[PDB]
Amino acid sequence: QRIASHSHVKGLGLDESGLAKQAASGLVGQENAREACGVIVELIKSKKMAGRAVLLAGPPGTGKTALALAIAQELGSKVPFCPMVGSEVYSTEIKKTEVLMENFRRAIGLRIKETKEVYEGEVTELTPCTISHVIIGLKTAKGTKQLKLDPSIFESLQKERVEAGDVIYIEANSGAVKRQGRCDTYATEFDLEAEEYVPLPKGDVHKKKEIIQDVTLHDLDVANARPQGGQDILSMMGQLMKPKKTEITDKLRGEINKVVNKYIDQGIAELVPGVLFVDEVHMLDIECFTYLHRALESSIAPIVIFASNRGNCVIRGTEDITSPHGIPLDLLDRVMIIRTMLYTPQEMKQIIKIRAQTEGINISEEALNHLGEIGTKTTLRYSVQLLTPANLLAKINGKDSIEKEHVEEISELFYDAKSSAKILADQQ
Amino acid sequence: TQRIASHSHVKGLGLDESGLAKQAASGLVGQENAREACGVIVELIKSKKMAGRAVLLAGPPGTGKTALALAIAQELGSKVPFCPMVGSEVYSTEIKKTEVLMENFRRAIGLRIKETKEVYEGEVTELTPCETENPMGGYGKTISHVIIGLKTAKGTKQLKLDPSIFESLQKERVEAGDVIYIEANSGAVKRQGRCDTYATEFDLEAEEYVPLPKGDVHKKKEIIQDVTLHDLDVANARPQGGQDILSMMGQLMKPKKTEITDKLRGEINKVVNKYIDQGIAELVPGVLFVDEVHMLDIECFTYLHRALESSIAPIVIFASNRGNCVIRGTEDITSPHGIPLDLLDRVMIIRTMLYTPQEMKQIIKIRAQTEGINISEEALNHLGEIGTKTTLRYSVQLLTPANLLAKINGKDSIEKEHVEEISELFYDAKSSAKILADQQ
Amino acid sequence: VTRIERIGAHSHIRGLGLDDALEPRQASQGMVGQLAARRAAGVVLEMIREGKIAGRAVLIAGQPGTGKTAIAMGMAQALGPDTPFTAIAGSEIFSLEMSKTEALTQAFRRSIGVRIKEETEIIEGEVVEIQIDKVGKLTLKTTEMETIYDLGTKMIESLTKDKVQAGDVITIDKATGKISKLGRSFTRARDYDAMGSQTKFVQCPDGELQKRKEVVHTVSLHEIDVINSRTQGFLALFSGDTGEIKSEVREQINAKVAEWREEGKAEIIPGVLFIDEVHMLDIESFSFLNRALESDMAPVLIMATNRGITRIRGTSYQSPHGIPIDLLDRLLIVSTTPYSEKDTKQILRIRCEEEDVEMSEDAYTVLTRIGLETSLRYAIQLITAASLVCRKRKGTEVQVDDIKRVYSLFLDESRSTQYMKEYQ
Amino acid sequence: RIERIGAHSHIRGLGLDDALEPRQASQGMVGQLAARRAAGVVLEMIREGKIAGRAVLIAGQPGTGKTAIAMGMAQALGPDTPFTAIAGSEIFSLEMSKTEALTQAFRRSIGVRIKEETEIIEGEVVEIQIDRPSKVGKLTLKTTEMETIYDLGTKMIESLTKDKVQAGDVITIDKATGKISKLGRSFTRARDYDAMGSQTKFVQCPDGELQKRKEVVHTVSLHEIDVINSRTQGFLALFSGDTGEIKSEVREQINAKVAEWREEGKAEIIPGVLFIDEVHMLDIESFSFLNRALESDMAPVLIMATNRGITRIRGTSYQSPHGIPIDLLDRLLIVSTTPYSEKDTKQILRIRCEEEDVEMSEDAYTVLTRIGLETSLRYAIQLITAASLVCRKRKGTEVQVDDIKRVYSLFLDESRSTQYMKEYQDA
Amino acid sequence: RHRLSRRVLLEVATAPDPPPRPKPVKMPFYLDSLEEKRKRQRSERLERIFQLSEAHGALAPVYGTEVLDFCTLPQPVASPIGPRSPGPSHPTFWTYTEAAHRAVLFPQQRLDQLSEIIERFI
Amino acid sequence: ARAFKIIREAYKKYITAH
Ligand SMILES: Nc1ncnc2c1ncn2[C@@H]1O[C@H](COP(=O)(O)OP(=O)(O)O)[C@@H](O)[C@H]1O
Ligand SMILES: Nc1ncnc2c1ncn2[C@@H]1O[C@H](COP(=O)(O)OP(=O)(O)O)[C@@H](O)[C@H]1O
Ligand SMILES: Nc1ncnc2c1ncn2[C@@H]1O[C@H](COP(=O)(O)OP(=O)(O)O)[C@@H](O)[C@H]1O
Ligand SMILES: Nc1ncnc2c1ncn2[C@@H]1O[C@H](COP(=O)(O)OP(=O)(O)O)[C@@H](O)[C@H]1O
């Protein structure tokens, strides 16, 4: 199923006591970093601390993004997780500040149990009783039922042109009448006619079932950003786009928070804090940092994970101010920094074996040994790449497994970064 | 409500009848050489003769540029328009830089226009036709006039109108016993519903029954409009209404200025002349106060002494605060006052002197009088002393918090200890700079 | 139970610890130390709540982690929710639809409140019958009385375009600003199974049909957006206004608000505009403020910058606090002295009291020492970190050993930089 | 009427003879014989309009009459010939590119006058009958020489009712379209004479034949054509801000159709002048485009005033004379302006003060020339009105030397303010 | 004030009342299971309508309607021509001159002005 | 308001008699 780069990482792999193993979950080594990750993962499940940040600092290829993906996986699906690249903040349509604001409102999830109900079946008759009400008979395989249908939605009933014979939905909450098409038994009434002829529903016309699906807070904000309807010319909202347009703090998000708190107090909604993740934070502008190190101090900001893929370098936007990890010292504080260190030959070999047994390739011992040794000369992220074409050539040669004659011969077709730099020193 | 500001004390230049500045008058003190220099340009403005003149208020920070700059709007009075703007308002996201300059240039040129129109009001009692003895062949009588009786709180009078007015009335679908509105100069007849005084019961319909109009049936009162050239420009630029679908684009923001000069040499700029020479409008050339002019871009500075050479342009009162500084938008240029030499060659510079302890003391006294603080003579002296060290701004800003500390400490007048306590809670720029230099 | 707002950074700051005489308490209302700074904060809060003068800017400066933003949030909390308090970061004005100046004008006008009050005669009652022949009559009903009303063309058009029906509890006023407020209840189950989204059953109104309703609401002076376009006010729910037409804004909104202040239908209540990290503003915005603070109606400013002698954005010059001197002239700077061994432990104990992280005395001492060595804010994170580490340890009180266990997991900025000897 | 005088309102045209020989101080132009003769040559080249795509640059010391010569040429050119004055900084727009702004500026100085021979009627309305029920009516028009009766049709009746003209009104009836343009009222009044009404005004009735063939003319610029032809937004060429013309679909078609019209004789040509003041502001790309924009038959001549010397070209780091690259500078020939001498500055000040209607004594002229020779000429000209106000304030008659000397101490020109700038205000 | 509490709805389920007639002039087949099912579904129906009615009126507007109508000045905010003048009784009529109104041309008036060049240049 | 109830009580009697 489209094996990805981090598909083998399924969790941090801590014990019941919180110590890091060489767990089969997909992570080996990085004992202290994995322990810190597991310690902070409990903060998310506690659902009491907001406005935090964790900086995963270390050389490239050491698996900080792997640690972030493991944190995301261990939580599960109930709590949202929003991975974002630092470069994505630079949007040419809307200011970066509001982009980051909306990004902060996307991690926070919201579970709500709606016990809605809809009515489905072949509409058998409409009898509009200045309309007092309209009775509609819906037929299904399990019987027929007559419903007094709130004449206010007779407008929509006519808008759908529905009449005796059609199969339609209707939502009890709002009147969302939806024409599925004509009934199956009415097909062939005209040997040629452009119709759908949807099958007759088999279940109970009265379809009452609970929906415990969750939505994001930014989704709510967007749904409350622009109006709806074509009163006179407002139809223009189904046309020219709405790219992440800026909301306003003073009158929209405040009211959203108020109404959400009201609903939560009534016991209907259910809040679930998420986890935001910013990749290559060094790419953000100095003003992005100046806004972030004060917005994350609020009482609603979710826990964030910062990942810097470089050491002491000049911060973008100043060109003359150096700071460790490309993050200013003013913002580098308030952030629990977790170091990520290099691996050992044994750990590299274990990672390569995990990637192999995950991708589905069986490899001999003498082959895996040199494939991992290459991980010492080259970076860990090169043997993983070489592994696949070796199996490809082997299968081309009939051999289902990877012998040492393939991994050592495919390393010649492709060159690594250091070799290319050595050859490319000529500027061409 | 007053809502005391930072410059709500300057009432005028304080010049005598001979044009000499008084030592202290109209809230301003000192700066006689400057208050007399910027007083001649007041008469220049009141002449409505020159166009594109410029005066540059160049001095150190806090000397009073804005003090005696907006005071000219007081001497000139509110009748002539006064358009103030800071140099940072030119940078915009929907209108080019050099265009905001022009837009502000035409907003300063006012144009007051007067019109006289008769008016009719009152309940129409009866509308009977006046007979014309068979003007055409023997078909039937003809309406030569229409006798209409209008009732008002003053009295009821019968009036004659033209037959075209009769046709307009018939197609208007009005009835008797209601209030109408006639304007003989144009001929259009408007309706104000029925007469709320006797015509309507407790019914619910909000037909907007107007009470029996009070006053003479016939009334005339000249309407005096005060429109600027920028207002009429934007009006001809962003039309209004509910027709002509092009105008129906009320959903879009439509901030789209940059009025093309075609619409300038053509419309309003021309009908302005056709109304002035006709005796309907009187041009009221105003002032264009542009402070912090050093913020303008090189393009803006270049366009400035091209728009200042146009016959249609108001005076300009610049306020440059920087000394010999690099022009914004260029490199390795050290033009004085942060203004290009070419533009400085076109402006008359008024140099404001530095305030002495006694003048700053008078200024503090006047600002305390304005804010309503009952500062004592010892507190005033100490404020002057501690203001001779720092700038005048910090010195005169220690009146509101000191007064609060006084009121909190059971007092009705700022004492010597109150400003001392406030002087330690808050400090000026130099003190904070030293504290920062001592730290990392 | 879990609300939208759990404990954040500045959550223990529930006010400003000053006596009636503005005398700062050593520890009160969550704040600690900063005696002179908190007294200055209270002095400026006094003029804020007073609202006579306009153009007061108070700058709070100091080392990173001395309580500038803390004092700002304390003032925000000490100040009642009635007066506006617009807190924005120095980078919020760098908009693409708005210039660096118009967004600042909107932020300024957002901190000026306007308590509007309106009175309108409302005719409300359950519709019993509606006849139409054009002319007709209306039979409105209440639980107390009933009456007939004769309609006309203007009313019939409004009763037809708005599909009122027998039972709809209508609400009418002078000028016929009709509202389909709610529906009768006696027409039980008008909707057996499916009901409209906007429909809802409500009990019959009480009292007489004619009732005087009084509505009071606090709208900000930024309401110009309500008339900046032909939209129905909903431009204030998104970007919307970008131009801030000076003529319209000033010469209509200010004049009409002054007129309302005389009629008594409104009253201005100036607020505060707190620009956090203001050193990110360019010389353009500073030179703009220089004049904006000189206007008739302008909120007070509060700034929190830690910059020493640093460069001013958009220029090669350097000035104190990284902003031009001409602006410092129009400010009122306040100090925020660094904390001592005692104040650090005190604020750490207060922060532990927030999340009920019961700590030991030795753990408190060790954490205070660590925070004095590396940083104040860092010690605030170790509280929750060690709490979570001890929770899995099946404990009930963070110990010194649990603090040291966390001290190795989450390294600080200093030690993190010290560990960058590999240089990848 | 009321359009206050400006800094360049005194020049009413180049003071040249029939042989392009500049006079000393005729028609407001003082001195500057060489540059004035050059401008006269280029203007004689303009009123001929048989070659398009040339350019001429006027360079010299600041305040020597470059923009003055430009305004003089503009005035001597008169109407019926598009003249566009633009500063180099005006093309830096946000709604269109620089090349687009330059194309618009060029095409704004190319006029197309379509001669239309439309026959109409012009006479005083004597009587009108209209039978409303379709509706039918009649009309009677009178001129000083003859009268006639017209049997109006349905659409003519509709038009006259929309205009709602009445007896005595003098109107013009377009036989083609039927548009009724009323010039005023003849010697007739009193619709009822008992109803209210405004004051009455009358004008003589038209003369000659009732129906006569006159000549209307519609003169528009090529820019206005491309504009109203750009898109279907109704009533363009004003539209307050917006031009997004397409190169091929519109521009080339406009050019081709104008050439076709010139071929048959509908509207041949009337080239104009594009005075680009302070052209040093233009970017390197602007000059790159101007290089090939002048290579077109529809490229009108442009005049540029330069004040810079050997200075880097904006948008790059290439030093070049006049701040203009030698690529564009290869076409345009340059004209040099000599700094005004003592007698030249004195006479310039004299004319500029006689333009403002202010009388200055003989010694006032001498002292002001002294100031304007030690200082810039613009400051000496600005000191003409400033000194003319203190005199009036003291109920004086003509400006004396004391008033000028006082207003000189009241203000600072360029050097008395920088020399006093020794306080380290801000930098 | 009138939220129509639950029990009120249950009580309203009683038989209806008869309408008035104002003209005064002066100063064995039965199925218990079917009845039970109908009663249960009717109770569910009433609970459903009560839930939906309570869920549609729980949100309060951010401004409402009187707030905007109060802040909403006449359509022309600062335009040089006045809004719809219902009569002379309100100041707004004696503030805008018709001459100033002729200074601003509406788009259809621009059409009337440009008709000639619109015809002969487009 | 209270007059409405008395007026309805008065109406009842007339209709009851006729
Ligand atoms: N502890 C680990 N266990 C398994 N695989 C790892 C581990 N650390 C790193 N890797 C592998 O090395 C690669 C590093 O990629 P990435 O996380 O993007 O680098 P970095 O995060 O250092 O910028 C990942 O694709 C991952 O599969
Ligand atoms: N002539 C004066 N009389 C009274 N007060 C003055 C005078 N000049 C300056 N001030 C005071 O000094 C303060 C700052 O001066 P300002 O004009 O803003 O400085 P600048 O114009 O140089 O930027 C003002 O608030 C004003 O009260
Ligand atoms: N007097 C105080 N009382 C309680 N907490 C404080 C105090 N001063 C500082 N803090 C804490 O220290 C942190 C400092 O953060 P911040 O205000 O952003 O630093 P600065 O304003 O110095 O840049 C705050 O999160 C706050 O909780
Ligand atoms: N030939 C001339 N005749 C009369 N006045 C002149 C002449 N040339 C320049 N001037 C005067 O010089 C002033 C400014 O000249 P300007 O056009 O700015 O010269 P430049 O274009 O070289 O800067 C004008 O006010 C004008 O009165």
The domain that holds A388 is classified in CATH as 1.10.8.60
Is C275 in the same domain as C418? no
Q: What residue type is assigned to position D326 of the chain?
A: I
At residue B328, φ and ψ (nearest 5 deg) are: -70, 125
The tokens of C100 are what? 């660096």
Phi/psi class of residue A332: alpha, beta or left (left: φ > 0; alpha: ψ in -120 to 50)?
A: alpha
For ligand 2, whether the C-beta of B65 sits within 6 Å is: yes
Question: Which residues on chain E are in Cβ contact (under 8 Å) with F10?
Answer: 24, 26
Which residue, by CA, sits nearest to atom 25 of ligand 2?
B6
Q: Which one, of B111, B112, B142, B110, lies nearest residue B129 by Cα?
A: B142
D251 and D289 inside one domain: yes
Distance from A295 to chain B by nearest Cα, in Å? 26
The answer as to whether D389 is a domain residue is yes
A210 and A356 together in one domain: no
Identify the residue whose C-alpha is closest to ligand 3 atom 5: C347
Alpha-carbon Rg for chain C in angstroms? 29
CATH number at residue C344: 1.10.8.60
B61 and B115 housed in the same domain: no
Query: Are the beta carbons of D48 and D40 closer than 8 angstroms?
Result: no
Tell me how far apart the alpha carbons of residues B372 and D350 are, in angstroms, rounded to a whole number: 54
Q: Which of E111, E120, E121 sits opposite D235 (nearest CB)?
A: E111
Q: Are D415 and D327 part of one and the same domain? A: no
Phi and psi at B122, nearest 5°, equal: 130, 155
Categorise residue B348: left if φ over 0, alpha if ψ from -120 to 50, beta otherwise: beta
Encoded tokens for A301: 């900001």
Residues after which a C–N gap over 2.5 Å breaks chain E: 27
d(CA A416, CA A376): 13
Same domain, B227 and B243: no
The helix (run of H) or strand (run of E) holding residue A377 is helix A365-377
CA distance D110 to D92: 22
Task: Name, in order, each residue with C-beta under 8 angstroms of B156's C-beta and a sequence gap of 6 or more.
Answer: B122, B125, B149, B150, B217
Note whether A228 and A324 are same-domain residues. yes
CATH number of the domain that residue B150 is part of: 2.40.50.360
Tally of CA atoms within 13 A in the half-sphere of B390 that contains its CB: 27
Neighboring chain B residues of C21 at a CB cutoff of 8 Å: 408-409
Q: Enumerate the known binding-site residues of C for ATP.
A: 62-69
Spell out the residues 6+ positions from residue B389 whose beta carbon is closer than 8 angstroms to its own.
none
Do B416 and B364 share a structural domain? yes
- C-alpha span between A296 and A294 (Å, rounded): 5
**What is the domain-level CATH number for residue B309?**
3.40.50.300
Breaks (C-N over 2.5 A) in chain D follow: 133
Residue at D423 is within a domain:
yes
Q: How far, in Å, CA of C44 to CA of B77, rounded?
A: 35
CA distance A128 to A138: 15
The answer to whether residues A377 and A396 belong to one domain is yes
Cβ contact, residue pair E64, C217, below 8 Å: yes
DSSP of D337-400, one letter per residue?
A: EPPP-HHHHHHHHHHHHHHTT--B-HHHHHHHHHHHHHS-HHHHHHHHHHHHHHHHHTT-SSB-
Instruction: Choose one of C307, C339, C371: the last residue of a domain.
Output: C339
The answer for residues whose C-beta is within 8 angstroms of residue D58's C-beta and 6 or more apart is D35, D38, D39, D66, D69, D70, D303, D304, D305, D306, D334, D335, D337
Domain end position, chosen among A223, A250, A285? A223
What DSSP line would sit under A115-182, residue for residue? --EEE-EEEEEEEE-----EEEEEEETTEEEEEEB-GGGHHHHHHTT--TTEEEE-BTTT---EEEEE
**Nearest-angstrom CA–CA distance, C215 and E61:** 13
Query: Is any atom of ligand 4 closer than 6 Å to the C-beta of D63?
Result: yes
- What's the Cα-to-Cα distance from D182 to each of B188, D127, D206, rounded to whole Å? 19, 15, 12
Same-domain check for residues C303 and C370? no
Say if D88 falls within a structural domain: yes
B70 lines ligand 2 (CB under 6 A): no
Same domain, A55 and A164: no
Size of interface B-E (CB pairs under 8 A): 90
Query: Is C204 contained in some domain?
Result: no
Cβ contacts of E42 within 8 Å, gap of 6 or more: none
CA distance C9 to A294: 10
Report the distance separating Cα A304 and Cα A104, nearest Å. 9
Do residues A123 and A161 both lie within one domain?
yes
Is some CB atom of chain E closer than 8 A to the CB atom of F4?
no
Residue B394's Cβ-side half-sphere holds a number of Cα atoms within 13 Å equal to 29
Residues C224 and C108 in one domain: yes
Q: How far apart are the C-alpha atoms of A370 and A408, rounded to whole Å? A: 8
D242, D106: one domain: yes
CA distance A1 to chain C (A): 34
User: What is the nearest CA distance from B91 to chain A, expressed in angstroms?
Assistant: 17
Q: Nearest to residue D398, comparing CAs of D426, D363, D369?
A: D363
Look at residues A154, A102, A147 and name the one whose alpha carbon lies nearest to residue A128.
A154
User: What's the number of domains chain D is made of?
Assistant: 2
Task: Report the 10 Å Cβ neighbour count for C280.
Answer: 24
CA nearest F17 in E: which residue? Answer: E24
Which of B210, B235, B260 is the last residue in one of the domains?
Answer: B235
Chain breaks in chain F (C to N over 2.5 A) after: none
- Judge if D97 and D80 occupy the same domain: yes
Residue C165 domain flag: no
3-state class (DSSP) for residue D123 = strand
Q: What is chain D's alpha carbon radius of gyration, rounded to the nearest angstrom?
A: 29
CA distance E121 to chain D (A): 6
Comparing CA positions, the residue from B290, B1, B247, B409 lying closest to residue C268 is B1
Per the structure, the complete domain to which residue A235 belongs is given by 1-106+224-342
Those residues whose C-beta lies under 8 Å from the C-beta of residue D404, and which sit 6 or more positions away, are: D360, D364, D367, D368, D371, D383, D387
For residues A159 and A96, membership in a common domain is answered with no
The tokens for B306 are 């091209």
Nearest ligand 4 atom, CA B342: 23
Within 10 A of B200 (CB to CB), how many other CB atoms are there?
14
Q: What are the C-alpha distances in Å from A110 to residues A77, A274, B259, B261?
A: 12, 9, 50, 56
Q: Choose among D4, D9, D83: nearest CA to D46.
A: D83
Question: Rg of the Cα trace of chain B?
Answer: 31
Question: Who contacts C401 (Cβ-Cβ below 8 Å, separation ≥6)?
Answer: none
Reading phi first (left if > 0) and then psi (alpha if -120 to 50, else beta), residue C356 is in left
- Kindly give, in sequence order, each residue whose CB lies less than 8 Å from that of residue D394, ignoring residues fewer than 6 positions away: B18, B19, D403
The strand pair at B315-320 and B54-58 is best described as parallel
- φ, ψ of residue E26 to 5 degrees: the values are -175, 170
Residue where one domain finishes, among candidates A342, A362, A379: A342
Residue found under tokens 């509207």: D267
- Token pair listed for B228: 């600027």
Residue D16: DSSP 8-state:
B
How far does CA C304 lie from the centroid of its chain?
18
- Asked if D320 and D355 sit in the same domain, the reply is no
Residues 6+ apart with CB under 8 A from A65: A6, A56, A279, A307
Q: Which residues of B touch C297 (CB under 8 A)?
A: 3
Burial of C369 by CB count in 10 Å (0-12 exposed, 13-18 middle, 19+ buried)? middle
What one-letter code names the amino acid at D58?
A: I
Q: How far is CA A1 from the centre of its chain?
A: 17
In DSSP terms, A279 is beta-bridged to A85, A307
Ligand 1 pocket mutation, candidates A37, A65, A346, A382, criterion most atoms within 8 A of CB: A65
Mutation test of ligand 4: which of D27, D303, D344, D377 has the most ligand atoms closer than 8 Å to its C-beta? D377
CB A375 within 8 A of CB A342: no
Method: cryo-EM
Resolution of this structure in Å? 3.2
C123: amino acid identity, one letter: I
Name residue, tokens 């105003």. B286
Q: Which two tokens stand for residue D420?
A: 């006093």
**Residue E31 CB neighbours (<10 A):** 9
User: Is D154:D134 a contact under the CB 8 Å cutoff?
Assistant: yes
**Measured between alpha carbons, how far is residue B311 from residues B307, C31, D306 in Å?**
9, 64, 22
For C351-355, the CB contacts below 8 A with 24+ separation are C351/C12, C351/C380, C351/C383, C352/C383, C353/C12, C354/C7, C354/C11, C354/C12, C355/A48, C355/A49, C355/C7, C355/C383, C355/C384, C355/C387
Q: What are B32's two structure tokens?
A: 């006689």
- How far away, in angstroms, is C328 Cα from ligand 3 center? 24
- Closest among C239, C205, C244, C203 to C221, alpha carbons compared: C244
Kindly report the CA angle at A161 between A158 and A167, in degrees rounded to 5? 115
Residue B156, annotated as binding a ligand: no
CA distance C82 to C71: 19
CB contact under 8 A, A117 and E48: yes
Separation of first and last alpha carbons in chain B: 47
Both B363 and B433 in one domain: the answer is yes
- How many CB atoms are located within 10 Å of the residue D255 CB? 18
B248 vs A contacts (CB less than 8 Å): 233
Shared domain check, C306 and C367: no
d(CA C248, CA C235) in angstroms, rounded, equals 16
Do C19 and C99 have their domain in common?
Answer: yes
Which CATH number goes with the domain that contains D63?
3.40.50.300
Are both B144 and B193 inside the same structural domain?
Answer: yes
DSSP classification of residue D411: S
Strand intervals (E) in D226-369:
270-271, 273-277, 301-306, 311-312, 319-320, 333-337
Task: Give me ligand 4 centre to Cα D68, in Å.
Answer: 5
CA pair distance B417, C60, nearest whole angstrom: 23
Which residues span the domain enclosing C94?
8-112+220-339
Within 10 A of D229 (CB to CB), how many other CB atoms are there?
20
Looking at the 3D structure of chain B, how many domains does it have? 3
φ, ψ for residue E98, nearest 5 deg: -65, -30
Tell me: do C354 and C410 sit in the same domain: yes
Put simply, the answer to whether D427 touches C317 (Cβ < 8 Å) is: yes
**What distance in angstroms lies between residue B10's CA and the mean position of ligand 2's atoms?**
9
Q: Is D102 in contact with D289 (CB distance < 8 Å)?
A: yes
Residues D315 and D346 in one domain: no
Q: How far is CA B143 from the centre of its chain?
A: 52
Same domain, B332 and B368: no
What 3-state class would DSSP assign to D311? strand
- Does residue D41 lie within any of the structural domains? yes
| Domain-embedded: residue D130 | no
Whether C279 is covered by a domain: the verdict is yes
**Residue E1, SS3 per DSSP:** coil
C-alpha distances (whole Å) from B160 to each of B176, B194, B213, C213, D198 are 16, 21, 20, 47, 15
Q: End of a domain among D289, D322, D340?
A: D340
SS3 letters for chain C?
Answer: CCCCCCECCCCCCCCCCECCCCCECCEECCEECCHHHHHHHHHHHHHHHHCCCCCCEEEEEECCCCCHHHHHHHHHHHCCCCCCEEEEECCCCCCCCCCCCHHHHHHHHHCEEEEEEEEEEEEEEEEEEECCCCCCEEEEECCCCEEEEECCHHHHHHHHHCCCCCCCEEEEECCCCCEEEEECCCCCCCECCCCCCCCCECCCCCCCCEEEEEEEEEEEHHHHHHCCCCCCCHHHHCCCCCCCCHHHHHHHHHHHHHHHHHHCCCCEEECEEEEECHHHCCHHHHHHHHHHCCCCCCCEEEEEECCCEEECCCCCCEEECCCCHHHHHCCCEEEECCCCHHHHHHHHHHHHHHCCCCECHHHHHHHHHHHHHCCHHHHHHHHHHHHHHHHHCCCCCECHHHHHHHHHHCECHHHHHHCCCCCC
Write out chain B residues lying below 8 Å of D235, CB-based.
Answer: 246
Last residue of a domain, one of D287, D314, D340: D340
The values of phi and psi at residue B288, to 5°, are -125, 95
